């Protein structure tokens, strides 16, 4: 009942009410460290939509990601090579700030598994995402069939393999149909199959 209303008020982010609420929050989040554990999901409605359930073994972690573009790791700014690789600061990163957020908490806590992440706040220099992590050995999680899949070995460190939602978007998986045909099993797997020279026995 209440959720269909909270969603509408979160759509109105530029409203006076939420502009104050968000300026009190960015202030606190600049005050705290980059990744901190949150007792409650700050946005319960968005967390539930992404799969949070208030049962033991589900954890929320808030992460700070630096806003901005990418600088290539180079010495003295010089990229030796053909002139098409000369640029060092103009390039923009291939993975979203949301994707970077999940992969940060993944290294900090490699025991936990990240189901999904959501946007909590942003100022000029940083963006704050909250990630839902699950303990795959917890008694409650292990015997609950809805989240048993995360306890399966294949779903381990999905943040690293880009199996998460943001990681899939970056790989282009979110879109199907024409225009996404050459990036389906993987962009490399499609490349190998399309470039394979199959020497058939009768050929």
């Amino acid at each position: 009942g209440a959720y269909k209303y909270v969603q509408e008020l979160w759509r109105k982010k530029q409203s006076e009410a939420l502009h104050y609420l968000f300026r009190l929050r960015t202030w606190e989040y600049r005050q705290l460290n980059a990744i901190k554990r949150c007792s409650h999901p700050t946005r319960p409605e968005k967390a539930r939509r992404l799969g949070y359930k208030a049962k033991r073994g589900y954890v929320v972690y808030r992460v700070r990601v630096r806003r901005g573009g990418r600088k290539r790791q180079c010495v003295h700014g010089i990229s030796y090579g053909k002139p098409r690789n000369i640029g060092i600061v103009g390039l923009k990163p291939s993975r979203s700030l949301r994707a970077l957020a999940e992969q940060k908490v993944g290294r900090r806590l490699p025991s936990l598994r990240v189901l999904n992440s959501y946007w909590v706040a942003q100022d000029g220099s940083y963006k704050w995402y909250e990630v839902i992590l699950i303990d795959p050995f917890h008694p409650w999680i292990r015997n609950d069939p809805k989240i048993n899949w995360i306890c399966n070995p294949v779903m381990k460190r999905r943040e690293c393999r880009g199996l998460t939602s943001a990681g899939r978007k970056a790989r282009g998986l979110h879109n199907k149909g024409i225009g996404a045909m050459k990036l389906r099993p993987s962009k490399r797997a499609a490349w190998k199959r399309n470039h394979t020279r199959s020497l058939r026995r009768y050929r």
Partner: protein
């Protein structure tokens, strides 16, 4: 040969030939693959000994104006077709009929095709229940291959009256066909001329 008259080759240069992912796929395992698929098929057949390995699939017009005449096998029977026989989707799956909610018949003739296929399968199917009935099960005989394999019938000449047939075809059919084909271009150009005529006085 050396220059002279040779069409230019459109085969792309080999990539990853020395280093990198293997871009050569050899087929010396092909005969072994055949034995493997049969062995997996034989093992699966035994696991459901009375039941056919392949589920009933629907006859479907092959797509495009190129193959619109012929019919092939589709993923599943539409909910409307199953409703026509009187089978719910779940009950149909138990009988062996694959069900696809996505498919829409797109015709009334398509539904009739499949409803008749479903009706025939229902007659061919025999449900062995009664707990264990081993003697009936021993002689059950598992159907092998695709169930009710689709048959594509060849064209057969028919007899027609030239007098009645000449009634539907306009005399000078080519003029009728060429007029219909070019009507849009002829109509646009004559509108373009009406604007020019309007824009002179």
């Amino acid at each position: 040969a050396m220059g002279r008259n040779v069409a230019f080759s459109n085969m792309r240069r080999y990539k990853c030939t020395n280093k990198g992912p293997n871009l050569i796929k050899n087929w010396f395992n092909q005969p072994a693959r055949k034995i493997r698929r049969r062995q997996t098929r034989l093992q699966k057949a035994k696991a459901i000994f009375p039941c056919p390995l392949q589920k009933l699939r629907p006859s479907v017009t092959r797509c495009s104006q190129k193959f619109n005449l012929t019919q092939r096998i589709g993923r599943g029977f539409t909910l409307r077709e199953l409703q026509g026989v009187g089978l719910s989707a779940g009950k149909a799956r138990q009988i062996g009929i694959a069900v696809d909610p996505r498919r829409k018949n797109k015709s009334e003739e398509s539904v009739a095709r499949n409803v008749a296929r479903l009706k025939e399968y229902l007659s061919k199917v025999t449900i062995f229940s009664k707990q264990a009935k081993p003697e009936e099960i021993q002689q059950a005989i598992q159907h092998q291959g695709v169930v009710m394999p689709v048959v594509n019938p060849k064209p057969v000449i028919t007899t027609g009256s030239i007098a009645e047939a000449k009634k539907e075809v306009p005399e000078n059919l080519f003029m009728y066909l060429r007029n219909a084909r070019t009507a849009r271009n002829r109509a646009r150009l004559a509108k373009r001329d009406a604007e020019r005529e309007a824009a002179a006085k």
